[PDB]
Amino acid sequence: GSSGSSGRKIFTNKCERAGCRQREMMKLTCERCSRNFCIKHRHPLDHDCSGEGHPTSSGPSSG
Ligand SMILES: [Zn+2]
Ligand SMILES: [Zn+2]
């Protein structure tokens, strides 16, 4: 039985911004978080950039 419908085509990109459905003909990835976004949210100032900002260091083993 048909379960789930996959969709992937090299035509347009999909912004990774919250409550955003902007499709930029060209691919736009941030330089800090390295995530896809729309020209509008392409800048790290018009989008909650969570790339190079949160301090992380190896500690726990589990995970
Ligand atoms: Zn966007
Ligand atoms: Zn970013």
From Swiss-Prot:
Positions that bind Zn(2+) 4: 30, 33, 47, 49
Binding-site positions, Zn(2+) 3: 15, 20, 38, 41
Induction of expression: Down-regulated by the miRNA miR-125a-3p in myelo-proliferative neoplasms.
Location in or out of the cell: Endoplasmic reticulum membrane
Organism: Homo sapiens
Post-translational modification: Phosphorylated by MAPK14. Phosphorylation has no effect on association with the proteasome complex.
Protein's UniProt name: AN1-type zinc finger protein 2B
Gene behind this protein: ZFAND2B
Annotated zinc fingers (AN1-type), start-end: 9-57
UniProt function note: Plays a role in protein homeostasis by regulating both the translocation and the ubiquitin-mediated proteasomal degradation of nascent proteins at the endoplasmic reticulum. It is involved in the regulation of signal-mediated translocation of proteins into the endoplasmic reticulum. It also plays a role in the ubiquitin-mediated proteasomal degradation of proteins for which signal-mediated translocation to the endoplasmic reticulum has failed.
Free-text comment about domains: The UIM domains specifically bind 'Lys-48'-linked ubiquitin polymers. The UIM domains mediate interaction with polyubiquitinated proteins.
Subunit organization: Binds 'Lys-48'-linked polyubiquitin chains of ubiquitinated proteins. Associates with the proteasome complex; upon exposure to arsenite. Interacts (via VIM motif) with VCP; the interaction is direct. Interacts with BAG6. Interacts with IGF1R (nascent precursor form). Interacts with DERL1, FAF2, NPLOC4 and UFD1; probably through VCP.
